[PDB]
Amino acid sequence: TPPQLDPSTPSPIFGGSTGGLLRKAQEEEFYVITWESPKEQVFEMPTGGAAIMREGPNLLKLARKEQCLALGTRLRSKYKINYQFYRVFPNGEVQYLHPKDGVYPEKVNEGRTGVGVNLRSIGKNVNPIEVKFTGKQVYDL
């Protein structure tokens, strides 16, 4: 799928907290989660407290990918809302992350290629001496 872009949509109503972004977002990266809600409603924040999600588009900036995914799974489970999130860099570069293919990763989908798949059982890994003085690991073979 062609990934969606990042508009200037509003943000949930929140009074502020000490659990938000720090200087790491200034110099390394931060994350942006966007969703759509049918009504204004209470939702617990992954950084502490409760915020009000507006009806229509919603955009929220967070410090970690894990926070974005936790909030997303909570939205999907409790409010039945589909979500997306992106990685934003200090130079304004935006990288689309999830859902990567347009389909959630727990559902099989064509066009995906396996990465890190070993065509053997876990008990067939070679002993360390066979990879000694080489830079390779036993599970990388």
Among residues 2, 39, 80, 122, the one that binds another protein under rule CB under 8 A = 122
Q: How far is the CB of 141 from another protein (least distance, A)?
A: 11
- With CB under 8 A as the rule, give the number of residues binding another protein: 74
> Residue 66 interacts with another protein (CB under 8 A)?
yes
- Closest to another protein by CB, 4 or 137: 137
Q: 1: closest CA among 114, 115, 109, 108? A: 109
Which CA distances in Å does 98 have to 73, 114, 137? 12, 18, 30
Report the Cα 124 to chain-centroid distance in Å: 34
Q: Does 16 bind another protein (CB under 8 A)?
A: yes
Query: Does residue number 127 form part of the binding site for another protein (CB under 8 A)?
Result: no
For position 57 contacting another protein by CB under 8 A, the verdict is: no
- The footprint of another protein on residues 74-113 (CB under 8 A) is 74, 88, 90-92, 94, 97-98, 100-101, 105-110, 112-113
- C-beta of 86: minimal distance to another protein in Å? 11
Residues 6+ apart with CB under 8 A from 31: 61, 62, 63, 64, 65, 67, 68, 85, 86, 87, 88, 97
- Contact call for residue 36 and another protein (CB under 8 A): no
Dihedral sign from CA coordinates of 50, 13, 26, 17? negative
Q: How far apart are CA 34 and CA 129, in angstroms?
A: 50
CB of 69 to another protein, least distance (A): 6
